Design an enzyme around this catalytic site. Structure first.
Site, PDB file in Angstrom:
ATOM      1  N   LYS A  48     -10.418   5.998  -6.154  1.00 27.85           N
ATOM      2  CA  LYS A  48      -9.075   5.866  -6.723  1.00 27.85           C
ATOM      3  C   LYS A  48      -8.260   4.839  -5.943  1.00 27.85           C
ATOM      4  O   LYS A  48      -8.258   4.891  -4.707  1.00 27.85           O
ATOM      5  CB  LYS A  48      -8.342   7.203  -6.688  1.00 27.85           C
ATOM      6  CG  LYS A  48      -8.396   7.979  -7.992  1.00 27.85           C
ATOM      7  CD  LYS A  48      -9.577   8.831  -8.128  1.00 27.85           C
ATOM      8  CE  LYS A  48      -9.442   9.811  -9.292  1.00 27.85           C
ATOM      9  NZ  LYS A  48      -9.559  11.166  -8.739  1.00 27.85           N
ATOM     10  N   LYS A  53      -8.345   3.960   1.086  1.00 33.76           N
ATOM     11  CA  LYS A  53      -7.087   4.314   1.733  1.00 33.76           C
ATOM     12  C   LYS A  53      -6.352   5.472   1.027  1.00 33.76           C
ATOM     13  O   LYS A  53      -5.438   6.057   1.606  1.00 33.76           O
ATOM     14  CB  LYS A  53      -6.187   3.078   1.843  1.00 33.76           C
ATOM     15  CG  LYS A  53      -6.522   2.167   3.032  1.00 33.76           C
ATOM     16  CD  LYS A  53      -5.477   1.075   3.219  1.00 33.76           C
ATOM     17  CE  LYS A  53      -5.682   0.277   4.523  1.00 33.76           C
ATOM     18  NZ  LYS A  53      -6.795  -0.638   4.311  1.00 33.76           N
ATOM     19  N   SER A  76       2.305  -4.162   0.131  1.00 31.93           N
ATOM     20  CA  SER A  76       1.986  -4.488  -1.249  1.00 31.93           C
ATOM     21  C   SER A  76       0.469  -4.506  -1.436  1.00 31.93           C
ATOM     22  O   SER A  76      -0.019  -4.858  -2.502  1.00 31.93           O
ATOM     23  CB  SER A  76       2.608  -5.827  -1.672  1.00 31.93           C
ATOM     24  OG  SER A  76       2.247  -6.164  -3.006  1.00 31.93           O
TER      25      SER A  76
HETATM   26  O1  LIG Z   1      -1.314  -6.941  -4.430  1.00 28.44           O
HETATM   27  C1  LIG Z   1      -2.355  -6.287  -4.335  1.00 28.44           C
HETATM   28  N1  LIG Z   1      -2.749  -5.390  -5.250  1.00 28.44           N
HETATM   29  C2  LIG Z   1      -1.897  -4.979  -6.353  1.00 28.44           C
HETATM   30  C3  LIG Z   1      -0.873  -3.965  -5.948  1.00 28.44           C
HETATM   31  N2  LIG Z   1      -0.267  -3.993  -4.747  1.00 28.44           N
HETATM   32  C4  LIG Z   1       0.609  -2.930  -4.698  1.00 28.44           C
HETATM   33  C5  LIG Z   1       1.478  -2.477  -3.719  1.00 28.44           C
HETATM   34  C6  LIG Z   1       2.228  -1.371  -4.017  1.00 28.44           C
HETATM   35  C7  LIG Z   1       2.098  -0.712  -5.235  1.00 28.44           C
HETATM   36  C8  LIG Z   1       1.229  -1.155  -6.202  1.00 28.44           C
HETATM   37  C9  LIG Z   1       0.472  -2.288  -5.924  1.00 28.44           C
HETATM   38  N3  LIG Z   1      -0.460  -2.966  -6.701  1.00 28.44           N
HETATM   39  C10 LIG Z   1      -3.256  -6.477  -3.200  1.00 28.44           C
HETATM   40  C11 LIG Z   1      -3.229  -7.360  -2.186  1.00 28.44           C
HETATM   41  C12 LIG Z   1      -4.371  -7.082  -1.390  1.00 28.44           C
HETATM   42  C13 LIG Z   1      -5.028  -6.020  -1.983  1.00 28.44           C
HETATM   43  O2  LIG Z   1      -4.339  -5.640  -3.093  1.00 28.44           O
END
Ligand SMILES: O=C(NCc1nc2ccccc2[nH]1)c1ccco1
Ligand SMILES: O=C(NCc1nc2ccccc2[nH]1)c1ccco1
Ligand SMILES: O=C(NCc1nc2ccccc2[nH]1)c1ccco1
Ligand SMILES: O=C(NCc1nc2ccccc2[nH]1)c1ccco1
Ligand SMILES: [Ca+2]
Ligand SMILES: [Ca+2]
Ligand SMILES: [Mg+2]
Ligand code: NA
Ligand code: NA
Ligand code: NA
Ligand code: NA
Ligand code: NA
Ligand code: NA
EC number: 5.1.1.18
Lengths: 315, 320
Positions: A48, A53, A76
């Site tokens: 998930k 994490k 993020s």
């Molecule tokens: O930007 C990324 N993923 C999308 C994302 N990032 C979030 C952060 C918070 C909530 C929903 C999110 N959705 C990322 C960078 C490195 C690995 O993943």
């Protein structure tokens, strides 16, 4: 002795197991051929939120038996994604603190995933100040991505499943950034089956865990490191270091090229969309230095820690 | 708060896991139909030594110190000639130290013969408590040994609680554990474990009505041992609860169900005939409890019930 014990891992397993995937272990004939080892891939890229994490994040948010009224994060990335999902599961709001000067791309992703954005100024100063305020105002909690004991304990549950799915495993290979995953895994393996080796894999461009094991003391990266393995840019910290010092058998460093080549190998030959950070463990088992590992260490489980790859940039 | 904590139970499971079996959880459609419930049988009758007591006995051998000045036991000593003595002997043999069983002169010859063939040494006492205590303390001191109580020694209680770590992991949807109780080391270790990890899961004790001190003690709200040695075919639960297990049982065990001799017998036979498991009648106590009339008072929400089949050490010749 340490900031967690295996009892905290077992608590975490009971606490999270209803809400996470017991991810499969896959194998690859070609990778076996290439390494001379029997390899087992613990597929946390199928977990998930697309990384392991969620295990630490759900363990930190959820009480096994003042509960958090919100979660707040600067991340993020995989951590923030995990914390948001965990919050949603618990019915509590998730806030991501993001520079005003952040990508327009990334702003929309966050709110699509169901976090509320709180914009700060690009200063670290301002990020921390805003996070603290939001935390206090919402009566919420911040969860450290690697040093929080509940996070380290949650990550340990990866090793419980591996020891059940691969009963004759001889070693686990774990990518290391802040070391919450490495340290949770080491606690678990050394508690349940200490003859099993625990190895870390690390970018040589971000080699603080290797340097600290070499020196015998915590030596964080002096500067933010430059690596395609964006998920392991954190240095090890004060809670993970004593565990890794005492319970991790060895650390294998790998070059940027090695990471890229190993990532591409997994994509083309196993058809698994791992993120480059998850290719770090594969590159370690392919590396020249890994040939110094005893031939008795045959059954090796590598943690494919994440699949959250930007296919836009997907060399 | 109690004589053991959940941390002690995890320490015990780290301490013993390389030498015991993760026993399976079996099911039976027939017993499901008879009880109305979804039953799960934790098969400690397949454990090393034929009962769960290897858990507490090995934990005690690997964790107790004989003395302030010596960290390693040089021998083990106990007054139990049954599942506990067998388990303690095995644990001692694994650790390369001698085992002594203090035995009344009045013990049957068959008891004396078995103890010796397993590999324990017998030390004789008078049938009197005074003599038994005198002799055991003598042996304990002479040998630099540990005396290991079958149910009140904290290291023993902590080892028995490992059953519940396995059950919870093996049966994630479990609603209740049913545990036969005598001295309550197994009940109290399980209760500490379940209540620390998932207190929504019920912990129920099962006890012969002919030896109902744990029921009487829970009823009265204080420790009320059997005034006289009980008469029951459930020979492994003739001990009363004691000062270390009673507070755990009082606070953390949800209910006690008592069962008649005929109910124990019928349940034991049912398991033999319909599950083909050679449980000892003591391990039939928990099955009788779930079949009993009073168990119908258990909420229908409590659906997934794991019963501990605590031992399989049965005298085949005697088989009442
Ligand atoms: O930007 C990324 N993923 C999308 C994302 N990032 C979030 C952060 C918070 C909530 C929903 C999110 N959705 C990322 C960078 C490195 C690995 O993943
Ligand atoms: O940045 C992200 N993940 C890490 C990453 N790191 C890369 C390095 C090279 C190529 C692709 C990569 N992707 C992301 C954004 C949206 C979802 O994931
Ligand atoms: O007579 C029984 N067991 C034989 C025995 N008892 C020992 C004690 C120490 C060492 C080996 C032993 N072997 C019994 C009674 C109730 C259940 O089993
Ligand atoms: O006496 C023993 N066990 C208890 C017992 N109690 C019974 C009652 C009826 C039938 C069989 C039984 N078996 C023993 C000696 C050697 C091994 O086990
Ligand atoms: Ca590093
Ligand atoms: Ca009783
Ligand atoms: Mg600390
Ligand atoms: Na899957
Ligand atoms: Na091996
Ligand atoms: Na002593
Ligand atoms: Na366990
Ligand atoms: Na339920
Ligand atoms: Na006490």
């Amino acid at each position: 002795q340490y900031d967690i014990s295996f009892a905290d891992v077992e608590k975490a397993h009971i606490n999270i197991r209803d809400s996470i995937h017991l991810t499969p272990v896959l194998t690859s004939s070609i990778l076996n051929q290439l390494t001379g080892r029997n390899l087992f891939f613990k597929c946390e890229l199928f977990q998930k939120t697309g990384s392991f994490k969620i295990r630490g994040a759900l363990n930190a948010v959820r009480s096994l038996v003042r509960k958090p009224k919100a979660v707040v994060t600067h991340s993020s990335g995989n951590h923030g994604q995990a914390l948001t999902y965990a919050a949603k599961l618990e019915g509590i709001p998730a806030y991501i603190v993001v520079p005003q000067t952040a990508p327009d791309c990334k702003k929309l992703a966050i709110q699509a995933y169901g976090a509320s954005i709180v914009y700060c100024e690009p200063s670290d100063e301002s990020r921390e100040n805003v996070a603290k305020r939001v935390t206090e105002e919402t009566e919420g909690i911040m969860v450290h991505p690697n040093q929080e004991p509940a996070v380290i304990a949650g990550q340990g549950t990866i090793a419980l499943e591996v020891l059940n799915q691969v009963p004759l495993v001889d070693a686990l290979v774990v990518p290391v950034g802040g070391g919450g995953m490495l340290a949770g895994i080491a606690i678990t393996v050394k508690a349940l089956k200490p003859s099993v080796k625990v190895y870390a894999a690390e970018p040589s461009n971000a080699d603080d865990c290797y340097q600290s094991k070499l020196k015998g003391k915590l030596m964080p990266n002096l500067y933010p490191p430059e690596t395609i393995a964006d998920g392991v840019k954190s240095s090890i910290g004060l809670n993970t270091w004593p565990i890794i010092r005492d319970l991790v058998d060895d650390i294998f460093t790998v070059t940027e090229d090695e990471i890229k080549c190993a990532t591409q190998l997994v994509w083309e030959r196993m058809k698994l969309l791992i993120e480059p950070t998850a290719g770090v463990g594969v590159a370690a088992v392919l590396s020249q230095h890994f040939q110094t590992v005893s031939p008795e260490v045959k059954n090796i489980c590598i943690v494919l820690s994440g699949g959250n790859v930007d296919l836009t940039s997907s060399w």
